[PDB]
Scaffold this active site. Structure first.
Site, PDB file in Angstrom:
ATOM      1  N   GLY A  10      -0.473 -16.602   1.762  1.00  0.00           N
ATOM      2  CA  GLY A  10       0.694 -17.108   0.991  1.00  0.00           C
ATOM      3  C   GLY A  10       1.711 -17.296   2.009  1.00  0.00           C
ATOM      4  O   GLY A  10       2.042 -16.445   2.828  1.00  0.00           O
ATOM      5  N   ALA A  92      -2.255 -25.593  -1.287  1.00  0.00           N
ATOM      6  CA  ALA A  92      -2.791 -25.191  -2.452  1.00  0.00           C
ATOM      7  C   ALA A  92      -2.032 -25.957  -3.720  1.00  0.00           C
ATOM      8  O   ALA A  92      -2.291 -25.976  -4.852  1.00  0.00           O
ATOM      9  CB  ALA A  92      -2.863 -23.878  -2.657  1.00  0.00           C
ATOM     10  N   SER A 133       1.615 -13.228  -2.748  1.00  0.00           N
ATOM     11  CA  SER A 133       2.453 -13.548  -4.122  1.00  0.00           C
ATOM     12  C   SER A 133       1.594 -13.599  -5.405  1.00  0.00           C
ATOM     13  O   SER A 133       0.513 -14.470  -5.180  1.00  0.00           O
ATOM     14  CB  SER A 133       3.502 -14.332  -3.754  1.00  0.00           C
ATOM     15  N   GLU A 247      -6.114  10.518  -0.055  1.00  0.00           N
ATOM     16  CA  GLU A 247      -5.260  11.536  -0.735  1.00  0.00           C
ATOM     17  C   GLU A 247      -4.214  10.851  -1.354  1.00  0.00           C
ATOM     18  O   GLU A 247      -3.814  10.868  -2.487  1.00  0.00           O
ATOM     19  CB  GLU A 247      -4.577  12.439   0.442  1.00  0.00           C
TER      20      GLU A 247
HETATM   21  N1  GTP Z   1      10.818 -11.443  -1.329  1.00  0.00           N
HETATM   22  C1  GTP Z   1      10.295 -13.153  -0.736  1.00  0.00           C
HETATM   23  N2  GTP Z   1       9.666 -13.831  -1.810  1.00  0.00           N
HETATM   24  C2  GTP Z   1       8.785 -15.127  -1.405  1.00  0.00           C
HETATM   25  C3  GTP Z   1       9.211 -15.281   0.000  1.00  0.00           C
HETATM   26  N3  GTP Z   1       8.651 -16.667   0.001  1.00  0.00           N
HETATM   27  C4  GTP Z   1       7.882 -17.039  -1.051  1.00  0.00           C
HETATM   28  N4  GTP Z   1       8.144 -16.027  -2.029  1.00  0.00           N
HETATM   29  C5  GTP Z   1       7.963 -15.739  -3.379  1.00  0.00           C
HETATM   30  O1  GTP Z   1       6.691 -16.469  -3.770  1.00  0.00           O
HETATM   31  C6  GTP Z   1       6.771 -16.956  -5.228  1.00  0.00           C
HETATM   32  C7  GTP Z   1       5.989 -18.241  -5.287  1.00  0.00           C
HETATM   33  O2  GTP Z   1       4.752 -18.086  -4.450  1.00  0.00           O
HETATM   34  P1  GTP Z   1       4.317 -18.982  -3.195  1.00  0.00           P
HETATM   35  O3  GTP Z   1       5.550 -19.469  -2.365  1.00  0.00           O
HETATM   36  O4  GTP Z   1       3.967 -20.550  -3.978  1.00  0.00           O
HETATM   37  O5  GTP Z   1       3.001 -18.538  -2.437  1.00  0.00           O
HETATM   38  P2  GTP Z   1       1.930 -19.595  -1.855  1.00  0.00           P
HETATM   39  O6  GTP Z   1       0.826 -18.690  -1.469  1.00  0.00           O
HETATM   40  O7  GTP Z   1       2.343 -20.083  -0.529  1.00  0.00           O
HETATM   41  O8  GTP Z   1       1.533 -20.619  -2.864  1.00  0.00           O
HETATM   42  P3  GTP Z   1       0.941 -22.065  -2.381  1.00  0.00           P
HETATM   43  O9  GTP Z   1       2.027 -22.690  -1.626  1.00  0.00           O
HETATM   44  O10 GTP Z   1       0.878 -23.044  -3.670  1.00  0.00           O
HETATM   45  O11 GTP Z   1      -0.262 -21.914  -1.584  1.00  0.00           O
HETATM   46  C8  GTP Z   1       7.906 -16.904  -5.556  1.00  0.00           C
HETATM   47  O12 GTP Z   1       8.136 -15.757  -6.445  1.00  0.00           O
HETATM   48  C9  GTP Z   1       8.826 -16.563  -4.254  1.00  0.00           C
HETATM   49  O13 GTP Z   1       9.852 -16.055  -4.746  1.00  0.00           O
HETATM   50  C10 GTP Z   1       9.928 -14.597   1.018  1.00  0.00           C
HETATM   51  O14 GTP Z   1      10.154 -14.863   1.900  1.00  0.00           O
HETATM   52  N5  GTP Z   1      10.397 -13.423   0.505  1.00  0.00           N
HETATM   53  N1  GDP Z   2       2.264  28.288   4.615  1.00  0.00           N
HETATM   54  C1  GDP Z   2       2.057  26.666   4.784  1.00  0.00           C
HETATM   55  N2  GDP Z   2       1.450  25.718   3.773  1.00  0.00           N
HETATM   56  C2  GDP Z   2       1.134  24.698   3.893  1.00  0.00           C
HETATM   57  C3  GDP Z   2       1.131  24.204   5.299  1.00  0.00           C
HETATM   58  N3  GDP Z   2       0.808  22.794   5.087  1.00  0.00           N
HETATM   59  C4  GDP Z   2       0.665  22.372   3.798  1.00  0.00           C
HETATM   60  N4  GDP Z   2       0.803  23.817   3.332  1.00  0.00           N
HETATM   61  C5  GDP Z   2       0.807  23.753   1.925  1.00  0.00           C
HETATM   62  O1  GDP Z   2      -0.888  24.066   1.583  1.00  0.00           O
HETATM   63  C6  GDP Z   2      -1.201  23.243   0.770  1.00  0.00           C
HETATM   64  C7  GDP Z   2      -2.522  22.893   1.416  1.00  0.00           C
HETATM   65  O2  GDP Z   2      -2.607  21.498   1.001  1.00  0.00           O
HETATM   66  P1  GDP Z   2      -3.355  20.376   2.227  1.00  0.00           P
HETATM   67  O3  GDP Z   2      -3.683  21.286   3.587  1.00  0.00           O
HETATM   68  O4  GDP Z   2      -2.447  19.267   2.680  1.00  0.00           O
HETATM   69  O5  GDP Z   2      -4.731  19.832   1.785  1.00  0.00           O
HETATM   70  P2  GDP Z   2      -6.252  19.762   2.452  1.00  0.00           P
HETATM   71  O6  GDP Z   2      -5.846  19.560   3.961  1.00  0.00           O
HETATM   72  O7  GDP Z   2      -7.157  18.653   2.112  1.00  0.00           O
HETATM   73  O8  GDP Z   2      -6.660  21.001   2.551  1.00  0.00           O
HETATM   74  C8  GDP Z   2      -0.088  21.992   0.685  1.00  0.00           C
HETATM   75  O9  GDP Z   2       0.064  21.502  -0.650  1.00  0.00           O
HETATM   76  C9  GDP Z   2       1.029  22.654   1.084  1.00  0.00           C
HETATM   77  O10 GDP Z   2       1.723  22.960  -0.536  1.00  0.00           O
HETATM   78  C10 GDP Z   2       1.660  24.825   6.449  1.00  0.00           C
HETATM   79  O11 GDP Z   2       1.483  24.475   7.528  1.00  0.00           O
HETATM   80  N5  GDP Z   2       1.915  26.337   6.305  1.00  0.00           N
END
Ligand code: GTP
Ligand code: GDP
Ligand code: TA1
Ligand code: TA1
Ligand code: GTP
Ligand code: GDP
Ligand code: MG
Ligand code: MG
Ligand code: ZN
Ligand code: ZN
Lengths: 430, 62, 426, 426, 430
Positions: A10, A92, A133, A247
Site C-alpha cells: 500500500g 486497487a 494500512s 520473548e
Molecule cells: N501516517 C500515514 N498514513 C498514510 C499515508 N499514506 C496513506 N496513508 C493512510 O492510509 C489510509 C488509506 O489507505 P490507502 O492510501 O488507500 O492504501 P492503499 O493500499 O494504497 O489503497 P489502494 O490505493 O486502493 O491500493 C488512510 O487512512 C491514509 O491516511 C502516509 O504517508 N502516512
Molecule cells: N544479577 C543479574 N540479573 C540479570 C542479568 N540479566 C538479566 N537479569 C535478570 O535475571 C532475569 C533473567 O531473565 P533472562 O536471562 O533475560 O531470560 P532467559 O535468557 O530466557 O533465561 C531477568 O529478568 C532479569 O530480571 C544480569 O546480567 N545480572
C-alpha cells in the site's frame, strides 16, 4: 544472523518504509546509496555484498506504479535491489475484492518468489515486519492474500505488523469500515502481534508537544519509524536486557486471539522545549501512561491494562526503571487486570535515539517506547463496526465488491468475527 | 466507558466561531467534546449539565 | 584434587559467571591472556581447582558456556575477559528461548543438550578428582529456567555421587522484568528441589537494597549486582583453594547445614560492605563483621529472617583472626538471638577460617543461612502463579511446545509441599 | 571505662554540642582531622570517655546528631570541626518541627525515633562500661522540646539504671525569640522532671549578663554563649577524664546533689571570668575564685539565689591547689552566708579537686547549685502558659497533630506540683 | 530540599513576580538567561538542569495575553520554562464570576498540571507563594478557583499568599469592593497566612522617605520584592536564628481565622539621606513601629498588637536586638494583648539586603522586616465593606456577575462571612 523480512504494502506502508529505511541508514551509518565509509550490527536488516554494498532486506509492493516509481527515482534509488521493487498495472481503487481476488492474484507469485530468495540468504531468520494500512484497497486485500500464503510456507516464523487504523473523525475514504472489517480475518488467524496506529492521535500529539500547527504525512512517518526502530534496537545492538522477538510476543500476548497492543513513544518533544526540562527516567516513564500520548484515539482509563512492554534505549539505569515502575504501580489511575500481578516487561538498550537531520524531533539521551495490550482498544473497534452497520443495512456500496468476484456472505461472516473479537476483550476484562 | 448523561464524548479540534450546546456561549480553547449520535459540542466544563442522549437526539429531530 | 566443573546458562547466568571469572582470576593473579602473574605461591598451589594447565604456562578455565542466542556469547567473548575461555566450550544455537520454559526444556535446546553433555564429559574426564558441579543461571525467563534445569537433570543422572551447587537469581514482585516469571520459576524449582544438593537463592531486590542503603551507590548497574553475587561465589569455595585453621569442603557444608533432604535452599551474604565515603571510619575487626553479617539488610533475598528461624548457618571467615574471638561471637549471636533459631538443634552455627583474605581487604566473612523465612519467597511466586493459571493465561505458548497443564499442576503441588515442609519446623 | 553517649537535638542543642566538642578536643589535643596531636599522656589516658578509637589511631566522637531540618546538619558538617563526626549518626528528616512540640513528639519525630535509637544502640554496645547519657537540647522550639524528651523517655525505658544527664537552654521573658515558648517548655519539663536524673538549666539572659557585666564583650554572639555553656559542660565531667585529689563520678555528684527524687534541676557556673583587658590585674588565687564563683552575677540562670536557699552545692576545682585552702574557703562561704543555705543539711558543699586545669589557665572552678530560687524560673513560664491557655491561643496547631488540651492541663498540673515541692522547703 | 512554589496571578501579581525574580536572580548571582558564572542556596526557588541552567520554580498565569506576552519578550524571556508561562484567550474584565466560573475553569486543569509537575520535582516541598490582587477579576476569581483545588490536592502544605488590597482613597476600579468581598472566602477557608498591602501607603512612603514625588508601580514592586526576599532570607541563607516557614506561622497565627498580618520593612531610605544617619539596630527596630512606616494605611495605635515577627538580616547581633525589643516593650504606644506576654518572634540572618542597580533604595548594612498580626487591620475591613453596602443596597453593578453563572445570594453570604471575621478580630481584642 537474527534477520528480519520487512514487506511494505500500500501507499501508506511504502511511504512508512521510505521513512523507516531512511532512519536505519542514519542509525547504522550507511550512505543513502548503499555504501558504508569508515560489527554486524547491520546484519538484521541489511545483507552485505562483496563490493561493500549493503542491500536492504525489504520488499516494496504496490499494484499501482506511482509510489514505487517515486522511490525508484528518489534519493534511495540505489539502495534497494531493483527487482524487489514490484509494481503492477492497475490501481486497487480502494476495494478489498480487487486486491485479494482479481488484480493482486497475478502479482503474488512474484512477491513470494522474492521473499523466498530473501529468506534463503538468512541463517537465523526470526520473523516478518509487514507495513500496511487497514483502509487501503491494496493495504487490506494484498496483505490478506500474502499472509494466507506466508502462514503456510513459513508458519513457525513470527509475524509482526504495523497498521494505520481508521480514526474517529479523520477519514480519507468512504469504504474504510468494509476494508478494515475484511482485514480482520487476516489479523485474527494468520498473525501474532499487530500494532494499531491512528493518524489523528499523532496529529494531536504533534500539535501539543512538537508545537507544529500543521504537519504533513512525513511527520507521522518519522514517528512510526522511530517506534519500529525502538522495537528492533534490542535486536541490532547490545543492551542490559535485550528482548528477543519471540520473548516479545510471549510477554505481550495472553490469549491466542488477544494480540492487538497499543504503541507509544516518549519523549515526543520539540528542540526548543527540551532545553528547559531534564527528561529524567521517571518523567519519561510517567509520560507513556497519560492519555495525551497514546497513538490511538482511545482513553486507557476506560479499560484495564493487560501487559506493558517498556523498551528503554539510551542512558537508562535499571534502578530508575524499577523506581519508575513502582511509582506507576502505586497510582490508582493506571488499573491492571487482577490475573496479571507481574504486568511489566522491561528491556534496556545502550543505543540512544538517532535524530533525522531534517526532522523536528529533538535529541535526547533517553527514550522509552511503551507497548500495551489493554482492553480500552476494544472501544476503538466498537466505533468502527458501528460505522459498518449503518452502511450494510442499506447494502450501500456492496455492488463494487460483489462485482469483482467477492461473495456477499463474507460481509456478514466478517461482521460476526469482530463481534467475537470485541466480545473477548470485554470477556477477559472481568 | 463514559455515559455521564448517556453518550460518548470524544476529543475534536475546534476552530472558528462555535457555541456550547448548553451554555449558549462561545468556546475559547482548541478542545471540545462531541457525541456522534447527538451531533453537539460543549465546553468540556458542562458535560454533566446536559440532558440524556435520548432527550437531546429526539429534540434535535424537530 | 577436588576439581570443579563450571557451567553458564542464559543471559543472567552468563553475565554473573563472567564476573565470577573476573573475581577469581584477580584472586589467583591470572592475566587476561591466561598467563600467571600473581605474587604468592598459594595462588598457584590450588590453581587446578578452577583452571586446566596448558602449554606455555597458560591456564584455561573449566567453563562450559551454554546459551540459545549468539548475542550473549559475542558479549562475553568481546568482554574484558572473553579471550580466556576455550573456543570449543562455546556451545550455542541461533533461535532464542523466547522466555519460554518449554522451548528450553523440550524443543529448541533439547537439540543442543547432547552437544553440551559431550563437552562437559571432556572437562570431567580431564580432571584428577572431581568434587562437584557449579552452575549459574536465572529462574526467570526460558533459557536459564529450562536449559539449566534440564542440564542439571542430565548431570545428576550421569554423576549421581558428586555434589551439585547451583546459584539462582529468581524473581521478586516489584522488580519483575518479565510477565511469565511465575510459570518459569514454578516449573524450574520443581526440579531444583529434587536434583540439586544446594541452591543459592538470589534476588535483585536485596542486591539493590544493599547497593542503596549500605553501599550508597547513586546508579548501580547489573555489573555491581554481579560483583556482589560473585563475591559470595568466590567466598564459599575458599576452603578448598587456600589453607586455613578450619577447612570445610562443599560436602562438609552440605552435611552440616542440610538437616533433611529437601530443605537445601540457601540464603547468602557477605561482609564487610561499606560505602567508599565511610570506609575510613569503620574498624574491620571480628565483632563488627559479625554484627553486619547477621543484619537483616545484608542478605541477598528479600525475605526478612525475622519472619522465621534459622535451621543452620555457616560463616566462612577469611583473614588472620583469633579462633577464640570467632567462637565467642558465634556463640553470642546465637544466644542473644535465641528466638530466631530452631531449639531442637543444639548448635546452629558452623565456622570455618582461612588465612588468605580477599585482596585489598584485611578480613572478610561469607554468610550462608538455611532459614524458614525463605518460604516467603516460595509462597509469593506460587501466589502469583495461582493468579494466572486459574484462568489459563499465556498457556497457549507453553502448550504449543508439547507441554501439558498436568505438569503445571504437579509443579505447583510440589511448591505447596516444599513451602509446607519449610513451614512445618518454623 | 565509664563511657558517655552524647546526643544533639534541635538547633541550639546542636550548636552548643558542636562548640562543646571543639572545646574538649582542644583539651584532649585532637586535631580537626581526628588525629591525635596532644602533648601529655594524660590526654590519651582516658580518651575513650568521649571518643571511639578507629584505625590509623584516629578518634571519632561518640555523637548522635539529630534534627528535623538538614540546614543545621549542613552548617555543622561544614563547620570548624564538622569532619570529625561519623557520617552515619547524621540522622535527619526533611520537614521541620515548625516550633511545634506535637510535631516533634508525635508526628514527624515519631518516625525518626526508631532510626536514632538504632544508632544509639550501636554506640552503647561499642562501650565497655557505659555510665550515662549526655543530651544537649533547648526547651523552646519544636525540635528540642519534643524530640529530646521523646528520646529521653525511650532511652530511660531501655536503660533504666544508667545516668540521664541533660543540659537545657530554657526560656526567659525579656530575651524570648518565639511566641509559643511557654507551651513547649511546660510540655517538655513534664517529661524532664520524671525521666532525667540531672538537668542543668541555662538562660540566654544570664549569659548575656555575663558577657556584658563580667566579660565586658561589646558584641557577644551566640558563639560566646555556646562557649560559656561548653565550659561548664567540660567542667562537670572532668573528674572521670583526669586524675585528682578528690574524684567525683557523675553518679557521686547525683547522690550528693539530689536529696529527694525530683529536685534535680541545677544552676551551673564557671570561674575565673575576666575581661581580656583586666586579666593582668586579677590574682587568680582560690579565695578570689571562690568569691566570684558564689557571686549572684556569675551564675548562668536568671534566678538570683538571694530569693532562695541552697539545698546542695558542688565545686569541681581543677589545677594544683591546696586542699586545706579549698576546705577553709568552702566552710567560710557556707558559714558567713548561712541564711541562704538549708540548715537541715549539716554540710551543703561537695568539693572535688582535679589535678589538670583547663588549657591556658592555672586553676579553674566549675559550680553547680541546687537552689530553691530556681522555682522563679519554673513559676514564670507557668504564668506565661496560664496567660495563653486561658484563651486557647495557638492550640489549633497542636491539636491538629492529635494532641489534647488534657495533656496541657496535666503538664501545668505537674509544673505547679514541682514549684510547690521546691517552695515547700524554702 | 526546602522548596517553595511561586504562583503569580493577575496583572499585579505577574508584575510583582517580575520584580521578585529580578531581585532573586541578582541575590543568588544568576544571569537573566538562567546561567550562573563563577552551595545549594538557590535550591529553594530554582531547579538545576544538567546544562548548568537554573529554571525558576514558578507558574505565571493571566487570562489575557498582554502582560505575560511582555514577560515572554522582555529580558527574562530565557529564564522561565516556556510552557509554565500560561495565557488564556479572553480578559477577565474585572469580574469575579468570569475568573472563577466561566473562563478560568478552562485553564485550571492546565495550571494544576503545571503545579503537579513542579511538585513532583520538589523533594522537600513546604508551601506556596501566591501573588495576586483583590481588585482584579482574575486576581479574585482565579485565586479562589485555584486555592480550593490546592487545599484538597496538597492539604498539608502551607499556603502563603501575597496581596495588593484596596486603599481608602486611591483606587482604579469601581467594583473593587465586590471582588475583595468575594475573595474573602478564599482567604478565610483555604489560606494560612495572607499578607495585605495597599498602594497608597507605599506611595506616601516613597514621598516621605525615598524623596520621590511621583513614583510608578515598579517602585512599589521593588519594595514588595524586598519584603518577600526578607521573608525567605532565613530559608535561602545561613543565620543565627533561622525561621522555618511553618515556625513562622506557628508564631504568627493565634487562632484559625486570624491570619492577616501587616507587613513593613526598614530602613526605607534614599541614597542621599543614609550618609547623614547611622542606621544602627536600635533605630531601625524603632523605625518599624511608627504609623508612618506601615504598608497598609491604618494607624497601629488604634489596635492592639497580637504577634510580631522581626526578621533581621545583615550585620546584626542578638544583643542589640534584645536591647531594642526591651525599649519597644518599654513604650506605652507599642501596646499588646494581655494574653501574649512573649509577643516577639525573632529571626536573624547573615546576608545583607541586595540592592537592584536601577532602584532608588540605598545600600544598608542592616535591614529588618516586621510582620505583625494586630487588631488594627480590622479597621481596613470596616472601610471596604462600607463601600460594598452602599453599592449592594442598590444592586448597583450586579447584573454583570449574575450574567456569568454567579448566584446572587453568594453576595450576602460573602457580606455575612466578613461580618464574622471583623467580629473575631474585635472579639480577641478584649
Ligand atoms: N501516517 C500515514 N498514513 C498514510 C499515508 N499514506 C496513506 N496513508 C493512510 O492510509 C489510509 C488509506 O489507505 P490507502 O492510501 O488507500 O492504501 P492503499 O493500499 O494504497 O489503497 P489502494 O490505493 O486502493 O491500493 C488512510 O487512512 C491514509 O491516511 C502516509 O504517508 N502516512
Ligand atoms: N544479577 C543479574 N540479573 C540479570 C542479568 N540479566 C538479566 N537479569 C535478570 O535475571 C532475569 C533473567 O531473565 P533472562 O536471562 O533475560 O531470560 P532467559 O535468557 O530466557 O533465561 C531477568 O529478568 C532479569 O530480571 C544480569 O546480567 N545480572
Ligand atoms: C581501600 C579499600 O577499602 O578498598 C576497597 C573498598 O573500598 C570497599 C568499599 C570495596 C570496594 O567494592 C565496591 O566498590 C563494590 C561495588 C559494587 C559491588 C561490590 C563491591 C572495592 O571496589 C573492591 C575491592 O575488593 C577487592 O579487591 C576484593 O578482592 C574483591 N575483588 C574485586 O572487587 C575485584 C575488582 C575488580 C576485578 C576483580 C576483582 C573480592 C571480593 C570477594 C571475593 C574475592 C574478591 C576493595 C578491596 C576495595 C575497592 C577497590 C574500592 C567493597 O568490596 C569488597 C568486595 O570488599 C564494597 O564494600 C566493600 C568494602 C571495602 O571497604
Ligand atoms: C592569657 C589568658 O588568661 O588567656 C585566657 C583569658 O584571657 C580569659 C579572659 C579567657 C578567654 O575567653 C574569652 O575571651 C571568652 C570569650 C567568650 C566566651 C568565653 C570565653 C580565652 O579566650 C579562653 C582561653 O581558655 C581556654 O583555653 C580554656 O581551656 C577553655 N577553652 C577555650 O576557650 C577554647 C577556645 C577555642 C577552642 C577550644 C577551646 C576551656 C574552658 C573550660 C573547659 C575547658 C576548656 C584562655 C586560655 C584565654 C583566652 C584565649 C583569651 C576566659 O575563658 C576561659 C574559659 O578561661 C574568659 O574569662 C576567662 C578567663 C581568662 O583569663
Ligand atoms: N503595586 C502594584 N499594584 C498593581 C500593579 N498592577 C495593578 N495593580 C493593582 O492592582 C489593582 C487592580 O487589580 P487588577 O490590575 O485589575 O488585577 P487583574 O487580575 O489583572 O484584573 P483582570 O484583568 O480583570 O483579571 C489595583 O489596586 C492596582 O493598583 C503593579 O504593577 N504594581
Ligand atoms: N546559646 C544559644 N541559644 C540559641 C541558639 N540558637 C537558638 N537559640 C536559642 O534557643 C532557643 C532554641 O530554639 P530553636 O532550637 O531554634 O527551635 P527548634 O529547632 O524547634 O528546637 C531559641 O529560641 C533561641 O532563643 C544558639 O546557637 N546558641
Ligand atoms: Mg494505493
Ligand atoms: Mg488583568
Ligand atoms: Zn458550556
Ligand atoms: Zn448523545
Amino acid at each position: 544472523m537474527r534477520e528480519c523480512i520487512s514487506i511494505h504494502v500500500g501507499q501508506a506502508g511504502v511511504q512508512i518504509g521510505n521513512a523507516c529505511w531512511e532512519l536505519y541508514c542514519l542509525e547504522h551509518g550507511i550512505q543513502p546509496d548503499g555504501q558504508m565509509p569508515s560489527d554486524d550490527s547491520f546484519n538484521t536488516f541489511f545483507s552485505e555484498t562483496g563490493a561493500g554494498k549493503h542491500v536492504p532486506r525489504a520488499v516494496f509492493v504496490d499494484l499501482e506504479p506511482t509510489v514505487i516509481d517515486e522511490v525508484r527515482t528518489g534519493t534511495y534509488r540505489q539502495l534497494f535491489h531493483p527487482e524487489q521493487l514490484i509494481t503492477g498495472k492497475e490501481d486497487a481503487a480502494n476495494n478489498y475484492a480487487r486486491g485479494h481476488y482479481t488484480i493482486g492474484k497475478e502479482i503474488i507469485d512474484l512477491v513470494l518468489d522474492r521473499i523466498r530468495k530473501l529468506a534463503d540468504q538468512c541463517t537465523g531468520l526470526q520473523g516478518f515486519l509487514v507495513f500496511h494500512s487497514f483502509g487501503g484497497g491494496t493495504g487490506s486485500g494484498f496483505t490478506s492474500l500474502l499472509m494466507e500464503r506466508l502462514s503456510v510456507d513459513y508458519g513457525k516464523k513470527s509475524k509482526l505488523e504495523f497498521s494505520i487504523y481508521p480514526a474517529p473523525q479523520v477519514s480519507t475514504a468512504v469504504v474504510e469500515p468494509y476494508n478494515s472489517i475484511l482485514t480482520t480475518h487476516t489479523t485474527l488467524e494468520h498473525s501474532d502481534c499487530a500494532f494499531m496506529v491512528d493518524n489523528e492521535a499523532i496529529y494531536d500529539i504533534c500539535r501539543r508537544n512538537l508545537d507544529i500547527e500543521r504537519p504533513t504525512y512525513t511527520n507521522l512517518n518519522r514517528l512510526i519509524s522511530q517506534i519500529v526502530s525502538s522495537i528492533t534496537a534490542s535486536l541490532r545492538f547490545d543492551g542490559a536486557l535485550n528482548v528477543d522477538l519471540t520473548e516479545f510476543q510471549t510477554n505481550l500476548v495472553p490469549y491466542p486471539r488477544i494480540h492487538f497492543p497499543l504503541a507509544t513513544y516518549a519523549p515526543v518533544i520539540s528542540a526548543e522545549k527540551a532545553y528547559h526540562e531534564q527528561l529524567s527516567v521517571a518523567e519519561i516513564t510517567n509520560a507513556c501512561f497519560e492519555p495525551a500520548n497514546q497513538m490511538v484515539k482511545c482513553d486507557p482509563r476506560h479499560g484495564k491494562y493487560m501487559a506493558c512492554c517498556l523498551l528503554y534505549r539510551g542512558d537508562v539505569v535499571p534502578k530508575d526503571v524499577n523506581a519508575a515502575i513502582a511509582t506507576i504501580k502505586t497510582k490508582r489511575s493506571i488499573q491492571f487486570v487482577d490475573w496479571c500481578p507481574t504486568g511489566f516487561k522491561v528491556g534496556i538498550n545502550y543505543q540512544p535515539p538517532t535524530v533525522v537531520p531534517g526532522g523536528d524531533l529533538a535529541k535526547v539521551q533517553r527514550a522509552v517506547c511503551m507497548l500495551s495490550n489493554t482492553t480500552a482498544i476494544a472501544e476503538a473497534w466498537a466505533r468502527l463496526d458501528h460505522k459498518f452497520d449503518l452502511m450494510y443495512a442499506k447494502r450501500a456500496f456492496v455492488h463494487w465488491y460483489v462485482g469483482e468476484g467477492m461473495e456477499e456472505g463474507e460481509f456478514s461472516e466478517a461482521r460476526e468475527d469482530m463481534a467475537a473479537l470485541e466480545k473477548d476483550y470485554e470477556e477477559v476484562g472481568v | 466507558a463514559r455515559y455521564t448523561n448517556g453518550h460518548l464524548f470524544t476529543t475534536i479540534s475546534v476552530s472558528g466561531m462555535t457555541m456550547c450546546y448548553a451554555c449558549n456561549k462561545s468556546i475559547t480553547a482548541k478542545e471540545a467534546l462531541i457525541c456522534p449520535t447527538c451531533n453537539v459540542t460543549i465546553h468540556n466544563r458542562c458535560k454533566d449539565t446536559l440532558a440524556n442522549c435520548t432527550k437531546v437526539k429526539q429534540k434535535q429531530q424537530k | 584434587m577436588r576439581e570443579i566443573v563450571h557451567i553458564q546458562a542464559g543471559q543472567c547466568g552468563n553475565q554473573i559467571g563472567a564476573k565470577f571469572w573476573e573475581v577469581i582470576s584477580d584472586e589467583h593473579g591470572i592475566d587476561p591472556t591466561g598467563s600467571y602473574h600473581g605474587d604468592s605461591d598459594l595462588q598457584l598451589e590450588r590453581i587446578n581447582v578452577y583452571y586446566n594447565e596448558a602449554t606455555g604456562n597458560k591456564y584455561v578455565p573449566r567453563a562450559i558456556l551454554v546459551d540459545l542466542e549468539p548475542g550473549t556469547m559475542d558479549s562475553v567473548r568481546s568482554g574484558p575477559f572473553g579471550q580466556i575461555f576455550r573456543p570449543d566450550n562455546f556451545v550455542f544455537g541461533q533461535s532464542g528461548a523466547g522466555n519460554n520454559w518449554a522451548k528450553g526444556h523440550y524443543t529448541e535446546g533439547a537439540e543442543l543438550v547432547d552437544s553440551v553433555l559431550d563437552v562437559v564429559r571432556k572437562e570431567s574426564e580431564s580432571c584428577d578428582c572431581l568434587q562437584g558441579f557449579q552452575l549459574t543461571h536465572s529462574l526467570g525467563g526460558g533459557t536459564g529456567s529450562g536449559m539449566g534445569t534440564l542440564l542439571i537433570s542430565k548431570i545428576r543422572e550421569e554423576y549421581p555421587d558428586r555434589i551439585m551447587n547451583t546459584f539462582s537469581v529468581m524473581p521478586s514482585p516489584k522488580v519483575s522484568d518479565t510477565v511469565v516469571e511465575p510459570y518459569n520459576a514454578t516449573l524450574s524449582v520443581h526440579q531444583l528441589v529434587e536434583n540439586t544438593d544446594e541452591t543459592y537463592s538470589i534476588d535483585n531486590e536485596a542486591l539493590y537494597d544493599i547497593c542503596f542503603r549500605t553501599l550508597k551507590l547513586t546508579t548501580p548497574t547489573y555489573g555491581d549486582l554481579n560483583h556482589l553475587v560473585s563475591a559470595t561465589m568466590s567466598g564459599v569455595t575458599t576452603c578448598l583453594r587456600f589453607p586455613g585453621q578450619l577447612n570445610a569442603d562443599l560436602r562438609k557444608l552440605a552435611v552440616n547445614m542440610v538437616p533433611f533432604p529437601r530443605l537445601h535452599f540457601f540464603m547468602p551474604g557477605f561482609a564487610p560492605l561499606t560505602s567508599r565515603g565511610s570506609q575510613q571510619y569503620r574498624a574491620l575487626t571480628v565483632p563488627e563483621l559479625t554484627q553486619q553479617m547477621f543484619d537483616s539488610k545484608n542478605m541477598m533475598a528479600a525475605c526478612d529472617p525475622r519472619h522465621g528461624r534459622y535451621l543452620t548457618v555457616a560463616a566462612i571467615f577469611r583473614g588472620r583472626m583469633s579462633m577464640k574471638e570467632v567462637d565467642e561471637q558465634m556463640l553470642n549471636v546465637q544466644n542473644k538471638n535465641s528466638s530466631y533459631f530452631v531449639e531442637w538443634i543444639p548448635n546452629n552455627v558452623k565456622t570455618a577460617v582461612c588465612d588468605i583474605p580477599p585482596r585489598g581487604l584485611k578480613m572478610s566473612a561469607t554468610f550462608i543461612g538455611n532459614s524458614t523465612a525463605i518460604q516467603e519467597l516460595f509462597k509469593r511466586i506460587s501466589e502469583q502463579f495461582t493468579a494466572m493459571f486459574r484462568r489459563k493465561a499465556f498457556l497457549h505458548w507453553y502448550t504449543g511446545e508439547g507441554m501439558d497443564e498436568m505438569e503445571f499442576t504437579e509443579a505447583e503441588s510440589n511448591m505447596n509441599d516444599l513451602v509446607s515442609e519449610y513451614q512445618q519446623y518454623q
